[PDB]
Every structure is written in C-alpha cells, then in structure tokens.
Amino acid sequence: DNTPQFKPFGITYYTERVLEGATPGTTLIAVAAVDPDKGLNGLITYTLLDLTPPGYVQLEDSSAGKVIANRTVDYEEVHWLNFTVRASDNGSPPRAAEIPVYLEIVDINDNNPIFDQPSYQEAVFEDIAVGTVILRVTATDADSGNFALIEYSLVDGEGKFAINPNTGDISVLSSLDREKKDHYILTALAKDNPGDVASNRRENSVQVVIRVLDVNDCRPQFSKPQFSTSVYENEPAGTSVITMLATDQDEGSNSQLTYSLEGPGMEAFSVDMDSGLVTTQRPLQSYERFNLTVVATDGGEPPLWGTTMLLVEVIDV
Ligand SMILES: N[C@@H](CCC(=O)N[C@@H](CS)C(=O)NCC(=O)O)C(=O)O
Ligand SMILES: [Ca+2]
Ligand SMILES: [Ca+2]
Ligand SMILES: [Ca+2]
Ligand SMILES: [Ca+2]
Ligand SMILES: [Ca+2]
Ligand SMILES: [Ca+2]
Ligand SMILES: [Ca+2]
Ligand SMILES: [Cl-]
Ligand SMILES: [Cl-]
Ligand SMILES: [Cl-]
Numbered sequence: 001d002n003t004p005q006f007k008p009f010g011i012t013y014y015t016e017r018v019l020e021g022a023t024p025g026t027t028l029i030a031v032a033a034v035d036p037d038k039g040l041n042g043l044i045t046y047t048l049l050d051l052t053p054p055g056y057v058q059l060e061d062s063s064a065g066k067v068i069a070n071r072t073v074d075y076e077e078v079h080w081l082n083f084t085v086r087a088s089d090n091g092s093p094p095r096a097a098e099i100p101v102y103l104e105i106v107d108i109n110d111n112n113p114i115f116d117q118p119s120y121q122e123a124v125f126e127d128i129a130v131g132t133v134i135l136r137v138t139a140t141d142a143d144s145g146n147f148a149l150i151e152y153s154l155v156d157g158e159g160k161f162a163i164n165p166n167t168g169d170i171s172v173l174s175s176l177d178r179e180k181k182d183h184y185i186l187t188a189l190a191k192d193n194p195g196d197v198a199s200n201r202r203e204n205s206v207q208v209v210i211r212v213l214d215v216n217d218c219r220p221q222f223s224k225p226q227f228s229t230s231v232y233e234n235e236p237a238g239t240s241v242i243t244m245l246a247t248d249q250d251e252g253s254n255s256q257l258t259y260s261l262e263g264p265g266m267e268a269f270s271v272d273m274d275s276g277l278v279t280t281q282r283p284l285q286s287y288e289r290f291n292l293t294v295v296a297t298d299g300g301e302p303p304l305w306g307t308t309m310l311l312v313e314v315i316d317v
Helices: none
Strands: 014-019 027-031 045-052 057-059 065-069 080-088 096-106 120-125 133-136 150-154 161-163 169-172 183-192 203-213 226-232 240-243 258-262 269-271 277-280 289-297 305-315
Touching (some): 150 161
Antiparallel strands (some): 133 169, 150 183, 183 203
C-alpha cells in the first residue's frame, strides 16, 4: 500500500537543458520513481501527460522514465518543453504520483544574418564631403544573445569608403573623383557571434553600388600653349587655316566645347564654334602677322574655359 515516489526523495520538479535541434531518439532527461511493494503492487508504469507544447517528447518505453526527442525542437519557436510524468503502480486500485518536468531549450547559432535588401545602391556627387554617410545597410539575425549580434564590414573599401561595424552606415573615407573612377561595387559583410572562433560565426554578404555623379571640375585644355601656321597671301575669305582641338575630362554638357577667338586678330579670322576650324575672313597681305587667342569653353554652369595662342604668318606665293 505504498504510492510510488520520485527520486531523489522529495524532488519538487525535474529540469534539464536541451540543445535545440537534438535529433529524434536523443535522450532528453531520465527520471525514476520507486515503490517498495511486491509484484504488481510495486511494478511501476510511466506515462507522460499535458505536453506543453505537444509533439517533442516521448518515453522510450513505459517500463522506465527515459524521455527522448520526438520532433526536433527549434529555439526560435519554443523556449520550454513542459510536461508531467505519471508513475503508477499496477495494484488493484492503482496508486500513482505525478510530477512536472521543465526542459529548458538552449539556443544554438543556426541562423545567419540576412540582409534586408538583395542589393543597395546610391548616387553621390563627386564633390561629396569626406565623412558623409551615403547609405545604411541592415541585416537581421533570428537567434538570441551573442548569436544574433551583428558586426558589419566591407571586404575592400578601396580607401574611399568605410562602414560602421555597429550601424552599417557606409561613409566617404576620402575624396571622390568621377574622372578617376565613376562608380564602385562594394561587398558588405554581416557576421554574427562576435568574439567567438571563426567556425561558430555565420555570415552573409551583399553588393553595394555607389555611382559617382559629375561636377564640372575640369577646364578645357589644349595640348600646348603655342601653335603656329602659315597662310598664303591673297587667298579668298573662307580659306582654311588650322583646326583647333581642346579636351575636357568631364561628362556630357560639362565637356561639350565651343570655340571662339579673342584679341587683336579676331576680326581677320573666324572659328567654327563646334568644329574648331579656323578660316580667314579676308585676303591677307604678306606683311601681316597675328597672334590670336583661341578659347575653348565647356557647357558647365558657370562654364570653364581654356586657351592657347595661334601664330599666323602670311607667306609669299
Ligand atoms: N585633385 C582634384 C581634381 C581631380 C580631378 O578632377 N582631376 C581630373 C581633371 S580636372 C581628372 O582627369 N582626374 C582623373 C585622374 O586624376 O586620374 C580633386 O581631387 O578633386
Ligand atoms: Ca505500491
Ligand atoms: Ca533554430
Ligand atoms: Ca546567428
Ligand atoms: Ca537558434
Ligand atoms: Ca573630378
Ligand atoms: Ca569641364
Ligand atoms: Ca567632373
Ligand atoms: Cl552628394
Ligand atoms: Cl561606433
Ligand atoms: Cl556609373
């Protein structure tokens, strides 16, 4: 006439830690009760009750208190597997005892940081100030504690960009120049579990495009400061003299050039504003000598100019 008692004697409840992902059949906890009596009166049958939540645990067999994994548990869904163990003798009116079990699920680092976008992109002007934040990348991590802390890095900022390891803010580290490099495709990395060994850290990367927009910061240039040419005396107006060509490193209208003439010979010559072709406006006589100023002006606002000099001598036929 003794009721089964759980061991150790007077135990209020059982508890054990269980790693999430424990495979089915894995022993989660083993409990035991005793009944001093003889035969069926002292033969103990174990059952489980009130599985909260259900589906994750079962007794290996009803003859013992070994509890094994059924479905695998996910810490991201379940923090506690609670249930009751009933230990019943097999007597005529049976006597039984019941006790709670609390299995404490333990997080493992089974989720990677995952970026909130498939890629990132911004456009910035080439004169953007050093230190300016361009964009923020964000990843999220479904684990807990250190396993969900994220450290951002750039695989290679090229000395032009830097990322804040906490915020994911990508900033200008040194001055840009569209003319040197007009866009960047950077790899940003999110790595969890800071401070642990490389093998227990998970990561993902994403590509970040920064397109560098033009400012009109390059003036038109000629190849040298002095050109020289000759025109025959007594040639008609419209006679070709020379074609002038300047360069400009900017983009679009910022490097679209128009030519003009300046100074004491402008009236005797003309330059086609688009082609750079210089022609005479009249016949020249052999004594005449001109040092013209040729100007190339870009289409920026305000425009930039560059000049060169053009010596024109008139030769006898
Ligand atoms: N040093 C200045 C000007 C740089 C710049 O814009 N240079 C132009 C010409 S105006 C260029 O062609 N840069 C290309 C290079 O240096 O390779 C800056 O850093 O802003
Ligand atoms: Ca008994
Ligand atoms: Ca999990
Ligand atoms: Ca993680
Ligand atoms: Ca986890
Ligand atoms: Ca530039
Ligand atoms: Ca320009
Ligand atoms: Ca430019
Ligand atoms: Cl900008
Ligand atoms: Cl910081
Ligand atoms: Cl680009």
